[PDB]
Design a protein around this ligand. Structure first.
Ligand SMILES: O=C(Cc1cccc(Cl)c1)Nc1nncc2ccccc12
Ligand SMILES: O=C(Cc1cccc(Cl)c1)Nc1nncc2ccccc12
Lengths: 304, 304
């Protein structure tokens, strides 16, 4: 019992963190096999982050200009290349701590753990989600760039995010490990406003099921609804529309609790229309949307 | 920018987790040097958790009855002893992954990270606090016993908690690594109700300072208060009394923000007396009390 915002154990990823310095900029890199991945803005000075031509700036860089350090030991860079917004630094040594891994590009609504790092050293781990506007609400300071987001399935780390920047609003933007930004963001110091940060409905429903499993049941009502009626309410409250694909994904939680998905939707509709009335659900006074249905089952089943 | 419930990177502790089985009970153990620490209730059957005499039950156990497995490899037990509510199993092999470590007994209000484990394998990491009633609000299932709580200072892991049980209310109780329970709890399947779960005032104030540092400032008011006036309000709202020791600890955050501690107390008094009015602070609709002043500075400074 109990329900917490839980991150994956970070050990497998800690063993991959390295420091990358180019010129006067230092950030984090991810060392997998004989390649170090890092944001390409490591090559920029502050004076050219305003409008950088990365291909042109990269011409003035050689392998010896990329200083890569794993703990206190220096790695020898024998090649470099740019793939989208990331640099791939080939080193002469395979990381002996390389876990089984995959690079995945996640969809909005999916959650992941972040290992916030500075100077190639891990500071902390937390859980977050790819927002519907393609930002993440992380906790990152200067030097955190190159920290990564990931999920773990038994022994395989699926890396999904690499941090690149903070928007003027204090929300975060970055790429997958192929260097493609999530959303429309660009690695440049210019006006980039985020779109509507819509609530992830299927995750709210999953967390209401977690609340029932963990004994918080006051919000269950005598009502039901339809997908189309529920979606009228979701639109009004800046919630993502619920689809039959989302209903299907909530099947296991509906089976565990005996609460039909559309009945849980009617409970959520009443909470949206009436608020919490000063009450809490799983220690929160708001509807939590950064637990997926998979996260709830995993946490409520103890998958290792 | 951004502020998250952040746990310490769990790698150093993952390397210490082992599985301990005695009879038909399996739980987690912590392997440091040549000793494995685990809850003494590993020796109990369900039939004797009602009123166990641990010294008597332990007489029927020999070193070969304690099966200790680190990953897929078995450890040889060459000694065993009971220290308070923990068993210490001496093994013939020092854990090669033993980090620099200390055993500390924490005070209520202090936070720590938990690495929830099942079968000696880590499932997840989360942050929590020792509540003023000496329980923790964790996320633990059957088999999680022996999972540990810790803090990290650079390269030293200070272990502060070992999980032993869940109370009928779904809150958690356990010991320090010397086997002494936090609070009045006993390792027995009997009536153990928790006391008032009081809010940790100094942590709420620290988190209001984190909110100001991160730009959430709507709650700052034109008022001040005194410790004695503030404490009249704290009593009414089941908040811990604020002392000059707590004011002293909030000094660095007061200096960073330029907001005198007693002014922040007057802001907190107004939030207690008037509520949030449907507004949020750092993405929460309630006053968060599981960030210490040290956690706020650490997170807002990027200590690795
Ligand atoms: O935003 C940047 C640098 C940057 C600027 C413009 C474009 C690009 Cl690609 C990168 N880095 C940081 N990232 N996250 C949190 C930060 C908190 C404070 C200062 C810096 C932060
Ligand atoms: O409570 C116990 C076993 C136990 C019973 C009485 C006394 C003692 Cl010392 C230990 N273990 C568990 N711990 N945390 C969460 C749990 C969720 C479900 C089931 C079991 C859980």
């Amino acid at each position: 019992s109990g329900f917490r915002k839980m991150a994956f154990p970070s050990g497998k990823v800690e063993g991959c963190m390295v420091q990358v310095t180019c010129g006067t900029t230092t950030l984090n890199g991810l060392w997998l096999d004989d390649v170090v991945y890092c944001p390409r803005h490591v090559i920029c000075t502050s004076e050219d982050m305003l409008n950088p031509n990365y291909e042109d700036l990269l011409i003035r860089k050689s392998n010896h200009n990329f200083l890569v350090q794993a703990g206190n030991v220096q790695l020898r860079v024998i090649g470099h290349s740019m793939q989208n917004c990331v640099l791939k630094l080939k080193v002469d040594t395979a990381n002996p701590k390389t876990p089984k891994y995959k690079f995945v590009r996640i969809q909005p609504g999916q959650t992941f753990s972040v290992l916030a790092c500075y100077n190639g050293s891990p500071s902390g781990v937390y859980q977050c989600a790819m927002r519907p506007n393609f930002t993440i609400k992380g906790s990152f300071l200067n030097g955190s760039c190159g920290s990564v987001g990931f999920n773990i399935d038994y022994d395989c780390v699926s890396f999904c995010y690499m941090h690149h920047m903070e928007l003027p609003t204090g929300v975060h933007a970055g790429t997958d490990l192929e260097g493609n930004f999530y959303g429309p963001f660009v690695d440049r110091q210019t006006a980039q406003a985020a779109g509507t940060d819509t609530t992830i409905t299927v995750n709210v429903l999953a967390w209401l099921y977690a609340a029932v499993i963990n004994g918080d049941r006051w919000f269950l009502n005598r009502f039901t609804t339809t997908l189309n009626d529920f979606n009228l309410v979701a639109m009004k409250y800046n919630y993502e529309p619920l689809t039959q694909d989302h209903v299907d994904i909530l099947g296991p939680l509906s089976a565990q609790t005996g609460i039909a998905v559309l009945d849980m939707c009617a409970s959520l509709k009443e909470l949206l229309q009436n608020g919490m009335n000063g009450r809490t659900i799983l220690g929160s006074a708001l509807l939590e949307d950064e637990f997926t249905p998979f996260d709830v089952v995993r946490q409520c089943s103890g998958v290792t």
